Structure 1
Amino acid sequence: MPVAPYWTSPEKMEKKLHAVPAAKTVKFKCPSSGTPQPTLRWLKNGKEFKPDHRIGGYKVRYATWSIIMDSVVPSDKGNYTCIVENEYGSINHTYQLDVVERSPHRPILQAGLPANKTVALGSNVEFMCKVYSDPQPHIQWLKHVQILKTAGVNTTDKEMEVLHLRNVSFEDAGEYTCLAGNSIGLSHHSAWLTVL
């Protein structure tokens, strides 16, 4: 009694995108059936996959129509397609794997910024601060202290990377600091404003 391969557990195939942090073990399954019993094969980005194609390789448990990847890494990012097929038909599902590396550290400020600037009395000057940080960082501008700018709903990160000092005076002369910190630590870069 011929029957083309078919998904036996279609619901456990709903999650097409698997985003995980590195090293996490990932397993994709294609529970299917059909007589005569269908064969199961996998494809990484359309091409033919093979155990030696990744460290530790892959493990295929036909018993559960699944493929397993131990300690996944950026190199594994891609599309994986399972192909269940017998003599009377074929079916296939495709999962998307995305591996995320997290940078759990205090914010990092672009070296060199802000930059010392010497300007004419009354001029206009703008200081810059390029911040990097996985967790949402909180930037704040200081004058040596006097808080001059602080990230938040009132002052979004859009405008926090640049401090504008309009029509300066001998008073505005001094050291400014860009302080940015997240829940892991604090980082800051200073800079000197020289007014003539």
Structure 2
Amino acid sequence: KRAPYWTNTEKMEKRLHAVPAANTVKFRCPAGGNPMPTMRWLKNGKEFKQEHRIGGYKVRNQHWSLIMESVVPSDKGNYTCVVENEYGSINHTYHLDVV
């Protein structure tokens, strides 16, 4: 029926985030599509794995979100959600700065 598309762009408008260390960070890319699109996250363009940071990370598919607790300076970088189904692939990038 259709390619992925962003449901709420208002949540995604702010691209640059400066947060104090120890804070929790949440990035979201609310999407729609049929079939239901999958979501994956990239850090600086590379597959972002649990082992890539001490606290790992949580993904809540129903909220199209990525969550990192107790952030540290090492967490600085680009975070890109990639949303895809049979009829297309779209992406969006946040930048995280820890202070």
| TM-score, normalised via structure 2 length | 0.98
Q: Are 2:45 and 1:39 aligned?
A: no
C-alpha distance after superposition, 1:107-130 (max 9, x if no partner): xxxxxxxxxxxxxxxxxxxxxxxx
- TM-superposed deviation, 1:70: 0.2
- TM-superposed deviation, 1:56: 1.4
Q: Which has more radius of gyration?
A: 1
Instruction: Provide the alpha-carbon RMSD of the alignment.
Output: 0.5
Give SS of 2:11's match.
helix
Identity percentage of aligned residues: 79
Corresponding position of 1:193:
none
The structure 1 segments of at least 4 consecutive aligned residues displaced by more than 4 Å after TM superposition are none
* Alignment partners' CA distance in 2, 1:38 and 1:46: 20
C-alpha distance after superposition, 1:68-92 (max 9, x if no partner): 0000001100000000000000111
Which structure: greater strand fraction? 2
* Alignment partners' CA distance in 1, 2:52 and 2:78: 15
* Alignment partners' CA distance in 2, 1:62 and 1:23: 24
C-alpha distance after superposition, 1:153-174 (max 9, x if no partner): xxxxxxxxxxxxxxxxxxxxxx
- Runs of 5+ in structure 1 lacking a partner? 101-196
- TM-superposed deviation, 1:52: 1.4
- TM-superposed deviation, 1:22: 0.2
Corresponding position of 1:95:
94
* Alignment partners' CA distance in 2, 1:82 and 1:43: 6
Residue 91 of structure 2 aligns to which amino acid in structure 1? Answer: N
- TM-superposed deviation, 1:18: 0.8
| TM-score, normalised via structure 1 length | 0.50
* Alignment partners' CA distance in 1, 2:15 and 2:89: 19
Q: How many residues align?
A: 99
C-alpha distance after superposition, 1:45-69 (max 9, x if no partner): 0011011111110101111000000
- TM-superposed deviation, 1:5: 0.3
